[PDB]
Design a protein around this ligand. Structure first.
Ligand code: CA
Ligand code: CA
Ligand code: CA
Ligand code: CL
Length: 333
């Protein structure tokens, strides 16, 4: 009847170690034979978690542990192990094992988007705001393991990382230095959100940054254009109204971006004059709302559109009924 070197074992085991990890070695001695002692787990309900090598006495995980999967306060498993002499003589030696599961950081921070966009001026001074990134951490709140911090990464795109920075706590992305870059360029800046858990986990996203002078994005003369009624009878080419913007050093190109799916209207993209393009019918349709936009030649020639507050407007077009002659009185009901 072997006797265990210790009559109880306690061991602390990190959650999320992989299947196979040896976590404890036990030992009993046969005082007579001094050899060939063998071991066995006696509490059959824990063969769900562990295996015990019959000759080495090494205990290992059959599956990784999960701290959060246990009832509150109960993240520990206690059980009996037994040791026999070579013959398997009855009663064996018996000891207690207690495996306590240590809580660990489970999740990385996750960004609200895979790709953020922003803009910056070619000559922007150090500290110009560009955009904010944001990540959340699924781990227990208020702990170092769910505390988010941001930084840039220079492994894949080192240059952007040298002209842009992100504030460690707020996730505001800003210019690191006074800029001197080419209008129309689009940088990819890689940002990383990391926590403060054991271990540390992180993920990353991309901020695409377009270089362009804010002043070279056109400003419409109005937010809402409300030209006079257009007659139901208007022939093709009749003028509806005219939109207009100014931009610094730029030719401007005008367009209709939505609301005109029937091609009932058209726009001269250079003059900004909106005209009747198809047939009109008051019974069929009495009013329209077009979304128009103004862009710089430079931006167009670069196959870009940049919709801002000021280079987008709505045009309200109201049709005039020409077949409206209600009678003097009607014997109605
Ligand atoms: Ca867990
Ligand atoms: Ca955990
Ligand atoms: Ca975390
Ligand atoms: Cl940074």
């Amino acid at each position: 009847s072997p006797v265990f070197t210790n009559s109880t074992y306690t061991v602390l085991v990190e959650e999320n170690l992989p299947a196979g990890t040896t976590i404890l070695q036990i030992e009993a001695k046969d005082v007579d034979l001094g050899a060939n002692v063998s071991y066995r787990i006696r509490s059959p309900e824990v063969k769900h978690f562990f295996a015990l090598h019959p000759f080495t006495g090494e205990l290992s995980l059959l599956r990784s542990l999960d701290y959060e999967a246990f009832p509150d306060q109960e993240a520990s498993i206690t059980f009996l192990v037994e040791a026999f002499d070579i013959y398997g003589t009855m009663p064996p030696g018996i000891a207690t094992v207690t495996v306590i599961v240590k809580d660990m950081n489970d999740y990385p921070p996750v960004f609200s988007k895979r790709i953020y966009k922003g803009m910056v001026a070619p000559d922007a001074v150090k500290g110009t705001p560009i955009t904010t990134v944001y990540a959340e951490d699924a781990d227990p709140p208020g702990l170092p393991a769910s505390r988010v911090r941001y930084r840039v990464d220079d492994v894949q795109f080192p240059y952007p990382a040298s002209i842009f920075e992100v504030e460690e706590d707020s996730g505001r992305v800003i210019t690191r230095v006074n800029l001197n870059e080419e209008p129309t360029t689009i940088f990819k800046l890689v940002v990383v959100a990391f926590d403060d858990g054991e271990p540390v986990m992180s993920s990353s996203a991309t901020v695409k940054i377009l270089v362009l002078h804010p002043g070279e994005i056109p400003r419409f003369t109005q937010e809402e254009y409300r030209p006079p009624p257009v007659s139901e009878l208007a022939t093709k080419g009749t003028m509806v109204g005219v939109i207009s913007a100014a931009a610094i050093n730029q030719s401007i190109v005008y367009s209709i971006v939505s609301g005109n799916e029937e091609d009932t209207f058209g726009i001269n993209n250079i003059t900004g004059v909106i005209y009747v393009n198809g047939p009109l019918d008051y019974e069929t349709r009495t009013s329209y709302v077009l979304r128009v936009q103004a862009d710089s030649l430079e931006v167009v020639l670069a196959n870009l559109r940049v919709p801002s507050k000021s280079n987008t407007a709505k045009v309200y077009i109201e049709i005039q009924d020409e077949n409206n002659h209600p009678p003097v009185f009607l014997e109605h009901h």
